[PDB]
Amino acid sequence: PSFEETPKFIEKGTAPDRALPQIRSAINQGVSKKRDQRKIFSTVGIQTSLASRTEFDALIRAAYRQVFERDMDSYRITEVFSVLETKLRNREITTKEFIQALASSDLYRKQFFEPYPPTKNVELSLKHLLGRATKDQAELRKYNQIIATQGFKPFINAILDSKEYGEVFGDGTVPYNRYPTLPAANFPNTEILYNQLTKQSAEVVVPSFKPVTSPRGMDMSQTPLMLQAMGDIAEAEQEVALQKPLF
Amino acid sequence: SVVTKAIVSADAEARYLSPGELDRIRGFVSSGERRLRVAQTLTESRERIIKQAGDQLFQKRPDLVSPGGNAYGAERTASCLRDLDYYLRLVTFGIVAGDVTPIEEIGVIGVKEMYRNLEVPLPGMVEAVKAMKSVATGLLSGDDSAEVGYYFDYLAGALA
Amino acid sequence: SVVTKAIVSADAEARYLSPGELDRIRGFVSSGERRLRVAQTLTESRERIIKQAGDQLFQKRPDLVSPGGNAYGAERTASCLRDLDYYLRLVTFGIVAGDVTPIEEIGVIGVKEMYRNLEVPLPGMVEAVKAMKSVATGLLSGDDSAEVGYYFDYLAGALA
Amino acid sequence: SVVTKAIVSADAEARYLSPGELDRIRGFVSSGERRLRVAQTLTESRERIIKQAGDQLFQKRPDLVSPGGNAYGAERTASCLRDLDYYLRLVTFGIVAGDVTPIEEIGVIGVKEMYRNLEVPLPGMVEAVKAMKSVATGLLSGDDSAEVGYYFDYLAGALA
Amino acid sequence: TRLFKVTALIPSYKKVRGGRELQNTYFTKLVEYDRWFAEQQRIQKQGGKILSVKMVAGKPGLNTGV
Amino acid sequence: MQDAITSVINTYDVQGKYFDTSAFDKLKAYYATGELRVRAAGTISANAATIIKEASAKLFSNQPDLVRPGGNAYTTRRYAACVRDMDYFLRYATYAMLAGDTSILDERVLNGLKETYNSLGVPISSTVQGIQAMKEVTGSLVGSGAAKEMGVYFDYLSSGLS
Amino acid sequence: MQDAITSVINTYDVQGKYFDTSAFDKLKAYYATGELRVRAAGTISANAATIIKEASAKLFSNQPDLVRPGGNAYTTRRYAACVRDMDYFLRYATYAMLAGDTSILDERVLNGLKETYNSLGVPISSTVQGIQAMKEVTGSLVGSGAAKEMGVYFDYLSSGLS
Amino acid sequence: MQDAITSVINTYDVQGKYFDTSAFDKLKAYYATGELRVRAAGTISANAATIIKEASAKLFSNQPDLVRPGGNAYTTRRYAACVRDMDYFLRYATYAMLAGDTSILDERVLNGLKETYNSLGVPISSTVQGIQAMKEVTGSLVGSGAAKEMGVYFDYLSSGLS
Amino acid sequence: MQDAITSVINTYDVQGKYFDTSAFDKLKAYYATGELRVRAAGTISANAATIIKEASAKLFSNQPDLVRPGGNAYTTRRYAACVRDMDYFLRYATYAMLAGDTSILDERVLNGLKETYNSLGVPISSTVQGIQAMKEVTGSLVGSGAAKEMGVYFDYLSSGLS
Ligand SMILES: CCC1=C(C)/C(=C/C2=NC(=C\c3[nH]c(/C=C4\NC(=O)[C@H](C)[C@H]4CC)c(C)c3CCC(=O)O)/C(CCC(=O)O)=C2C)NC1=O
Ligand SMILES: CCC1=C(C)/C(=C/C2=NC(=C\c3[nH]c(/C=C4\NC(=O)[C@H](C)[C@H]4CC)c(C)c3CCC(=O)O)/C(CCC(=O)O)=C2C)NC1=O
Ligand SMILES: CCC1=C(C)/C(=C/C2=NC(=C\c3[nH]c(/C=C4\NC(=O)[C@H](C)[C@H]4CC)c(C)c3CCC(=O)O)/C(CCC(=O)O)=C2C)NC1=O
Ligand SMILES: CCC1=C(C)/C(=C/C2=NC(=C\c3[nH]c(/C=C4\NC(=O)[C@H](C)[C@H]4CC)c(C)c3CCC(=O)O)/C(CCC(=O)O)=C2C)NC1=O
Ligand SMILES: CCC1=C(C)/C(=C/C2=NC(=C\c3[nH]c(/C=C4\NC(=O)[C@H](C)[C@H]4CC)c(C)c3CCC(=O)O)/C(CCC(=O)O)=C2C)NC1=O
Ligand SMILES: CCC1=C(C)/C(=C/C2=NC(=C\c3[nH]c(/C=C4\NC(=O)[C@H](C)[C@H]4CC)c(C)c3CCC(=O)O)/C(CCC(=O)O)=C2C)NC1=O
Ligand SMILES: CCC1=C(C)/C(=C/C2=NC(=C\c3[nH]c(/C=C4\NC(=O)[C@H](C)[C@H]4CC)c(C)c3CCC(=O)O)/C(CCC(=O)O)=C2C)NC1=O
Ligand SMILES: CCC1=C(C)/C(=C/C2=NC(=C\c3[nH]c(/C=C4\NC(=O)[C@H](C)[C@H]4CC)c(C)c3CCC(=O)O)/C(CCC(=O)O)=C2C)NC1=O
């Protein structure tokens, strides 16, 4: 006979049985595959405009698709930004200034600033320029104040001159969806924003953040650690009483 | 996959696949049967490969299966050889896919953090993968050995 | 060429060429002699191809050589046939390169603005290059004709 | 150090230091003297620390100095002990600075790539740092041992 | 005024990057006037060295037309 | 998105199985049709402007109200948006035809499309008719063998919108 | 965020009141427990990697299917994300214990976490058992009083996720 | 970047010439060297890390003051940056060898390298010596036939830095 | 945004109709009220700071709780936020008056404003009262002729919130 038992490492790696509904769900469960099935466009070459022309035009059109969410050929976007493209080919400016000129353009303002309230403006421009939704209440306050007091272009430049843009995208890469893991609620809000087609909805995804200043109940004064604290302060008070004269 | 990679590249550019990418897909599709034969050959002899790779590894690194080692005991050695089985399956997946994308997406991204949480030696993983490469490329011919060792080399470089 | 595109693809994610790209380069350099033969065939017969394509173009689009047409007159018809010669030379360059990059970098980037400044109808160009495709693929054998028709079709689509 | 980190944090918002931040700096400059004594004690006994740490490492990990190991050879053992000397000097720097910033910016950024180029096993470095911590904390008192072992634990985690 | 032409080196200290980055290390860039204070502040913060900046577009001392 | 090969890989990975006879059969079936798929893709890419040309002509002949005032396709901007959408459908159907899998359609075309069209006022039934017109033109151009297998993805898009 | 000191300050600021004897008593209680809180935070920080080691080991022992092929913790990437989430929970629970208040939990962990995990097919119940595994491991290291303290914040995360 | 084929294409484009016998001879010469170039590129891809290790060891043996304190390569960061530069030199020399033309070197590697090294304090002569040591190490592995061809591009790199 | 003229234009464009007598009548009506609108806008530009001063003073006099401890407008930050919201409302109501259309109100102010105020706990009734205070002050300054027109847009905003 020479019975040959099934090796243990076979069963150590077996999966539960799964029909088609569970197989489909198991394939598509975690973070969306768009996170890795994508290209990131950066001006890796400092070479002249004469060579690598096609790569550089691909970068330009990727920047258009990132700032305006799609191709804007009907709006003759190429001739509007012709001088800008010429400067970026001649390496007079970097990718970040190209993005700054597209995001501060009149076309961008008509597409994403004029149609929406300032909160939606903050979240849309943060999606287009930082790759994420509005992060917390402090960021909403900061950009709301800029929009209220200085308007649209200082708002765009405040986003683009922030340290976060410099750390993530620097001066050479076109922005992209970041799939941010931190902080809390950034990931789902960002996914909601980036799973939306252009003009899919006019609703504000993140109107504001509900304050955590006051909860209802759970004073935490009954906590046994705090109870021990009130126990020990009593002993301290008793000692202070004892250092008084006995009479 | 080559087809997936070309389609992703074309879609990131909002264009149709150029004649160059279609020629790449042509070449990939033509070589499909040979790669399928290599993957079938690896699949038919998985138990032999895993057992021999484990024997070579534990001869080379007896500490892992000595008491106090990571893979000491029948169950832990079973888990070790199960890891090797996982990576052999990913090697066959990459062979049919034509690139290291299955290996990278399943067993490479975050492998160091995972094995650090498992207190599993990364060098030992490297010798285990090298043993797998030797045993598997032994079964193949001269031409197929280079292609399969490419995937094994990528995975071993990913480990350390 | 194919070598240049493989190299830039490697530089995109910063690693040495994979065995797939090396096999692609090997197949390309192996197929060098046949594509040089194709380029010779299309180059020695340049005049017949240009004249037949121009005659077919003027038959199917007589308004080009009619009064008020862009190719009306002897000089303008000469310039028309000259552009046809340009694009035939670019097709031979693309055949030798193994891809459409020479055609793009010499005659597609900015072709729309260039022909707009010249009052040249782009449908006329498309039909002209389709006529040139037919005339050129008539001279070739089936395997070579398919490869050449790839470049011709891609040029026609780029002009469209 | 702590002063530099505070200054950078304030320059991030373009403001002078808060009263609490100045209180933090006051606490730092108050603990500066005890930190100086601790680093003095560590720098005085550097020779014995290096000797004991190297001996303990080589007894725990004989394969490093055994034939076939990276540390085998008189010159290679000297290089190993020299690396230990570097890391002890960096630990003293971190102790006087009050933070792991000098430690990282001399010997933690790119350490994995350097030791990969040098065939140097990372678990060997981790064990060297652990034995070195054991010796150093043995020579120091109970109070100093906690913060001195803190930087060694940070360094070991960096190598691991 | 309205334009500076800036040549600055920005070294890397936080990490050794897998990508080339010899896009972003040594560069010459055109930056508009109201941008330069913040921009120079940024290059100073990542530890860069400003090698030179020049007037290109406008004329110094203008009261309007800036 | 998934092609046929990565679809098989994903199923066998989530099941933790090595490739069996069925998996190799499916991979062989995909490799056998790859030549057809590549030629169809190249032909469509060369004739894409022509396909959209004829299909939009058919759609606006059958539904003249779309481009007359009061129609969703009445303006130069909205007409351009409509033909741009038909270019979208043709390009992504060609992608799904090359990949041999409708996965990219769900991932990158149909996601949020029905409700985007509803919010915009785009008539979905007319869009389905335009997709059908593109199906007919493409099938005429690329030949029957590629015609049926392009029609599969055109029907997938139509049913997803419908 | 908000700590115990800031909690007292905000309570008296909403009333527009200077501090009373009760406020001073609460502040003295927090100052009394500060040293125990610092010791617990230090011992947690020193042993965080070990706590994650054991907690993940217990969770994947009790629920093997999570790390079997097709499970939500089956890939090197998804397993890494799992242990990263556990380290997140441990770090923020340490933050909350050191602060003496749970407002940081609601603000920086639980806000959007349930629908984060539901959009990802992460098993929320399994995450809850991972959190109890961390609770059990941490309690044995920090000591009885600090164990009862850390348990409050661990149970807060467990209840917010549930 | 342009390879030998694109170089011939450009030199016949600037003249407005169809390909003649001379161009065909040059193209045949490149196609003849193609298999040798592919073999050398594959060999270097197999042994890139080994070559960099040996060449860096040789360089720092010849000039040990570089890695001692006070040298340009003294830290983990600066040593890593040195071996990373050596990696770039080897990989781009392999690219230029495969293309058969040196334009990629000037286009990507040698543009601004001189100024960046001088302004960062990186010594030019030691980098040239490292490139040389790379050249001898690579020549032994590739084989005598490919050794001279790869030495051409290594010498181009050095002369550009020199 | 949309104004009265562009509204008439859009209405007639959708019908594909040239301008008839009614269209010219509406255009004449807007051109007749244009000078009054311009004078009102100029006055509001001149006195916007004073308008916000007096409107906020009136609102906080009628509802002193809002700026005392415990009120939503009690802090320097929340007081500034309240004044910033009222500045928004005044400027956009001025825009809507100068346009003769409330579309800009819907598309820059009211969309999501109720959700923002409900998320923050901002009292809607008191915001409406502040808008009434702005309405009274603005109507007093602009005069009887433009007060009725300006109150239309202030009332539109108030009804949009309430
Ligand atoms: C600071 C508060 C905070 C948390 C906690 C947080 C968690 C979080 N977990 C995520 C994914 C995930 N989370 C887990 C966690 C595991 N799944 C297993 O079944 C276990 C039951 C469970 C833990 C014990 C896994 C497996 C993924 C999938 C990662 C992927 O698909 O790549 C993601 C999506 C983005 C990413 O993966 O980087 C987030 C944002 N985000 C936050 O802002
Ligand atoms: C498909 C991608 C993938 C991989 C690779 C993977 C590895 C992996 N190995 C594990 C355990 C293990 N892995 C090993 C293997 C080690 N033993 C020796 O030291 C060797 C150096 C080395 C193998 C050659 C061992 C011994 C264990 C048991 C650990 C324990 O139970 O404490 C575990 C914990 C869950 C379990 O035991 O089932 C995972 C997730 N998981 C994945 O989803
Ligand atoms: C201050 C920051 C810094 C560090 C840390 C550093 C490490 C370092 N160690 C080196 C050599 C070495 N280092 C070691 C040490 C290893 N041998 C055993 O395996 C041990 C586990 C381990 C030491 C504990 C050895 C064996 C060599 C010789 C390598 C060789 O020559 O092949 C070298 C090559 C240059 C030379 O040998 O002079 C460097 C750069 N250099 C720096 O500028
Ligand atoms: C892709 C083409 C390319 C190359 C090759 C290149 C070289 C290069 N090496 C650098 C870092 C470095 N490179 C070296 C290595 C040098 N010093 C040693 O003495 C060696 C002899 C020699 C290496 C052979 C060192 C020491 C640094 C760190 C310098 C510092 O920032 O202090 C830097 C600064 C950016 C960074 O730190 O990452 C550049 C630009 N740059 C490019 O854009
Ligand atoms: C309100 C903005 C707007 C415009 C301008 C517009 C133009 C327009 N013209 C069309 C047809 C046409 N338009 C023309 C006009 C051309 N014939 C000659 O070449 C001339 C040079 C030129 C006119 C001066 C012709 C010939 C057709 C018929 C095309 C065909 O059926 O193939 C069509 C297709 C539907 C139809 O037949 O009605 C549109 C949409 N549509 C709009 O919504
Ligand atoms: C590839 C994935 C993808 C799809 C499918 C897509 C559809 C899409 N079509 C749009 C507009 C449009 N789409 C149409 C199409 C309609 N016109 C006629 O009625 C027809 C029946 C019908 C088309 C056959 C029209 C008229 C608009 C303009 C709507 C408007 O601006 O008012 C928009 C709004 C933003 C924009 O124009 O860029 C989207 C998002 N977007 C995408 O990113
Ligand atoms: C907790 C943070 C906070 C502060 C500080 C605050 C100040 C504040 N002071 C106010 C009035 C006032 N405040 C002052 C005080 C000024 N006049 C003099 O010149 C001095 C320079 C200066 C005081 C030292 C005066 C005179 C008024 C009356 C203004 C008026 O009636 O129009 C008001 C208007 C509402 C009211 O009177 O109840 C506020 C909100 N509110 C807050 O929520
Ligand atoms: C242009 C359209 C638009 C508006 C108007 C708008 C208002 C707005 N008001 C806000 C906060 C606020 N708004 C108010 C004002 C209200 N509470 C007071 O008691 C008054 C009764 C009343 C005003 C008359 C207050 C007090 C806050 C602060 C709420 C908080 O931070 O908790 C915020 C959050 C950002 C920040 O605090 O800076 C927004 C976005 N957003 C928009 O996109």
Helices C74-97 and C142-159, axial angle in degrees (round to 10): 120
SS3 (DSSP) at A13? coil
H residues 84..143 contacting A (CB < 8 A): 107-108, 111-112
Task: Name E9's bridge partners.
Answer: E26, E49
Q: Which residues of B touch G80 (CB under 8 A)?
A: 109-110, 113-114
Contacts of A66 (CB under 8 A, 6+ apart): A99, A128, A174, A175, A176
Closest C-alpha to A33, from B5, H51, C127: B5
Q: How far is the CA of C160 from the centre of ligand 5 (A)?
A: 20
One-character DSSP codes across chain F? ---HHHHHHHHHHHTT----HHHHHHHHHHHHTHHHHHHHHHHHHHHHHHHHHHHHHHHHHH-GGGTSTTSTT-SHHHHHHHHHHHHHHHHHHHHHHHHTSTHHHHHHTSTTHHHHHHHHT--HHHHHHHHHHHHHHHHHHH-HHHHHHHHHHHHHHHHHH-
Q: How far is the CA of B118 from the centre of ligand 2 (A)?
A: 7
User: What residue's CA is closest to ligand 2, atom 16?
Assistant: B80
In whole angstroms, what is the distance from residue B140 CA to residue E50 CA? 59
Closest C-alpha to G136, from G44, G40, G55, G42: G55
- Minimal-distance CA residue of chain I relative to F70: I14
Question: Encoding tokens for residue I17?
Answer: 């109709």
In whole angstroms, what is the distance from residue D4 CA to residue B41 CA? 62
SS3 (DSSP) at E49? strand
Give the CA diameter of chain E. Answer: 48
Helices B74-97 and B32-44, axial angle in degrees (round to 10): 170
Helices marked H in chain I — which ranges? 4-14, 21-62, 76-99, 103-105, 113-120, 124-142, 144-161
Contacts of C73 (CB under 8 A, 6+ apart): none
Q: Which of A116, A119, A146, A155 is the best mutation target for the ligand 8 pocket, counting ligand atoms within 8 Å of the beta carbon and taking the most?
A: A119
One-character DSSP codes across I108-136? IIITTHHHHHHHHT--HHHHHHHHHHHHH
List of chains touching D (3+ CB pairs within 8 A): B, E, H
**Count of alpha carbons within 13 angstroms of residue D35, beta-carbon side:** 18
Task: Name A173's bridge partners.
Answer: A42
Closest C-alpha to H156, from H91, H109, H86, H99: H109
Closest C-alpha to C87, from C40, C133, C48, C55: C133
Write down the experimental method used for this entry.
cryo-EM
Contacts of I71 (CB under 8 A, 6+ apart): I65
Sign of the torsion angle spanned by Cα atoms D99, D102, D107, D108: positive
Query: SS3 breakdown of chain A: % helix, strand, coil, rounded to 5?
Result: 50, 0, 45
Is any ligand 6 atom within 6 A of the Cβ of residue F78? yes
* Residue I10 exposed, middle or buried by CB count within 10 Å (0-12, 13-18, 19+): exposed
Closest C-alpha to F18, from F26, F9, F6: F9
The C-alpha of A149 sits at a distance from chain I's nearest C-alpha, in angstroms, of: 9
* Residue F31 exposed, middle or buried by CB count within 10 Å (0-12, 13-18, 19+): buried
In a mutagenesis test of the B interface, which of A5, A12, A34, A35 is the best target, namely the one with the most B β-carbons within 10 Å?
Answer: A12
Question: Encoding tokens for residue I101?
Answer: 């259309």
Give the helix/strand (H/E) hosting E4.
strand E3-9
In whole angstroms, what is the distance from residue B10 CA to residue C13 CA? 17
Shortest-distance atom of ligand 5 to CA F69: 43
Question: Encoding tokens for residue H144?
Answer: 């005598």
SS3 (DSSP) at H116? helix
Helices marked H in chain A — which ranges? 8-11, 20-27, 53-67, 77-80, 82-89, 95-103, 106-108, 118-130, 137-149, 152-160, 163-168, 186-194, 224-242
In whole angstroms, what is the distance from residue B59 CA to residue C10 CA? 38
In whole angstroms, what is the distance from residue A45 CA to residue C8 CA? 11
Q: How far is CA C27 from CA C8, F78, F131, H34, H39, in A?
A: 18, 48, 39, 10, 13
Would you call D160 an interface residue with chain B, using a CB distance cutoff of 8 Å? yes
Contact F123, F26 (CB under 8 A): no
Ligand with minimal distance to H80 CA: 4
Between vectors from CA I42 to CA I37 and to CA I48, what angle results, nearest 5°?
115
B residues 109..128 contacting G (CB < 8 A): 109-111, 113-114, 117, 119
In whole angstroms, what is the distance from residue G106 CA to residue G157 CA? 8
Query: SS3 breakdown of chain D: % helix, strand, coil, rounded to 5?
Result: 80, 0, 20
The C-alpha of H117 sits at a distance from chain D's nearest C-alpha, in angstroms, of: 20
Length of chain F: 162
Q: How far is the CA of I84 from the centre of ligand 8 (A)?
A: 7
SS3 (DSSP) at A232? helix
Helices D19-44 and D122-139, axial angle in degrees (round to 10): 90
Q: How far is the CA of F137 from the centre of ligand 5 (A)?
A: 22
Q: How far is CA I63 from CA B56, H8, I58, I68, I116, in A?
A: 84, 85, 8, 10, 22
In whole angstroms, what is the distance from residue I113 CA to residue A118 CA? 10
Q: What is the dihedral of CA A23, A25, A26, A28, to 10 degrees?
A: 120
Report phi then psi at A53, rounded to 5: -65, -40
Contact F84, F49 (CB under 8 A): no
**Identity (one letter) of the amino acid at H120?**
L
Task: Tell me the residues of A at the C interface, defined by beta carbons under 8 Å apart.
Answer: 44, 53-55, 57
- What one-character DSSP code corresponds to residue A221? T
Taking CB atoms and a 6 Å cutoff, what residues make up the pocket around ligand 2? B 64, 70-71, 76, 79-80, 83-84, 86, 106-107, 118, 120-121, 124-125, 128; G 60, 67, 74-76, 79
In whole angstroms, what is the distance from residue G162 CA to residue I143 CA? 60
Question: Encoding tokens for residue D140?
Answer: 């120091």
Task: Name E49's bridge partners.
Answer: E9
Q: How far is CA I99 from CA H103, I3, I47, I49, in A?
A: 61, 5, 20, 22
The total of other beta-carbon atoms located within 10 Å of residue A52's CB is 19
Report phi then psi at H39, rounded to 5: -60, -45
Helices A118-130 and A137-149, axial angle in degrees (round to 10): 110
Task: Name E28's bridge partners.
Answer: E7
Task: Name E29's bridge partners.
Answer: E6
In whole angstroms, what is the distance from residue D25 CA to residue D6 CA? 8
Closest C-alpha to D129, from D91, D76, D74: D91
The C-alpha of I21 sits at a distance from chain A's nearest C-alpha, in angstroms, of: 32
Question: Encoding tokens for residue A85?
Answer: 């493209």
Would you call G107 an interface residue with chain I, using a CB distance cutoff of 8 Å? no
SS3 (DSSP) at H153? helix
> Is the preceding peptide bond at A183 cis, omega within 30 degrees of 0?
yes
In whole angstroms, what is the distance from residue G79 CA to residue G87 CA? 12
Question: Encoding tokens for residue B157?
Answer: 């470089």
SS3 (DSSP) at A117? coil
Q: Which residues of I touch A116 (CB under 8 A)?
A: 107-108, 111
Give the CA diameter of chain H. Answer: 61
Question: Encoding tokens for residue C9?
Answer: 């693809």
**Identity (one letter) of the amino acid at C49?**
I
One-character DSSP codes across D25-89? HHHHHHHHHHHHHHHHHHHHTHHHHHHHHHHHHHHH-HHHHSTTSTT-SHHHHHHHHHHHHHHHH
Contact F6, B97 (CB under 8 A): yes
Would you call B7 an interface residue with chain F, using a CB distance cutoff of 8 Å? yes
Provide the phi-psi class of A196: left if phi over 0, else alpha when psi is between -120 and 50, else beta: beta
Is it the case that chain A and chain G have 3 or more CB pairs lying under 8 Å apart?
Answer: yes
Is any ligand 6 atom within 6 A of the Cβ of residue F122? yes
SS3 (DSSP) at E50? strand
C residues 27..66 contacting B (CB < 8 A): 27
The total of other beta-carbon atoms located within 10 Å of residue B19's CB is 22
Closest C-alpha to B145, from B33, B34, B29: B34
Taking CB atoms and a 6 Å cutoff, what residues make up the pocket around ligand 3? D 64, 70-71, 76, 79-80, 83-84, 86, 106-107, 114, 118, 120-121, 124-125, 128; H 60, 64, 67, 74-76, 79
SS3 (DSSP) at I29? helix
In whole angstroms, what is the distance from residue B19 CA to residue C156 CA? 13
One-character DSSP codes across chain C? -HHHHHHHHHHHTT-PPPHHHHHHHHHHHHTHHHHHHHHHHHHHTHHHHHHHHHHHHHHH-GGGTSTTSTT-SHHHHHHHHHHHHHHHHHHHHHHHHTSSHHHHHHHTTTHHHHHHHTT--HHHHHHHHHHHHHHHHHSS-HHHHHHHHHHHHHHHHHH-
Contact G92, G109 (CB under 8 A): yes
Q: Which residues of A touch C108 (CB under 8 A)?
A: none
In whole angstroms, what is the distance from residue A145 CA to residue A138 CA? 11
Report phi then psi at B113, rounded to 5: -65, -40
Contacts of D34 (CB under 8 A, 6+ apart): none
Residue whose tokens read 């409050």: G152
Contact B47, B81 (CB under 8 A): no
The total of other beta-carbon atoms located within 10 Å of residue B157's CB is 15
The total of other beta-carbon atoms located within 10 Å of residue H103's CB is 17
SS3 (DSSP) at E22? coil
Q: Which residues of E touch D110 (CB under 8 A)?
A: 15-16
Residue whose tokens read 């893991």: A181
SS3 (DSSP) at I95? helix
Closest C-alpha to C25, from H5, H11, B140, F37: H5
**Count of alpha carbons within 13 angstroms of residue B44, beta-carbon side:** 10
In whole angstroms, what is the distance from residue C135 CA to residue C85 CA? 13
Query: SS3 breakdown of chain B: % helix, strand, coil, rounded to 5?
Result: 80, 0, 20
Question: Encoding tokens for residue B47?
Answer: 């138990």
One-character DSSP codes across B71-101? T-SHHHHHHHHHHHHHHHHHHHHHHHHTSSH
Contact F66, F73 (CB under 8 A): yes
Resolution (Å units): 2.6
Closest C-alpha to G56, from G157, G132, G130, G136: G130
In whole angstroms, what is the distance from residue F15 CA to residue B79 CA? 18
Sheet holding E26-32, edge to edge: E26-32, E3-9, E49-55
Contacts of I161 (CB under 8 A, 6+ apart): I110, I113, I114, I117, I124, I127, I128, I131
Q: Which of A29, A212, A221 sits opposite G107 (nearest CB)?
A: A212
Closest C-alpha to C38, from C85, C87, C99, C95: C95
Taking CB atoms and a 6 Å cutoff, what residues make up the pocket around ligand 5? F 60, 67, 74-76, 79
Closest C-alpha to D109, from F109, E16, A235, A116: E16
Would you call G14 an interface residue with chain I, using a CB distance cutoff of 8 Å? yes
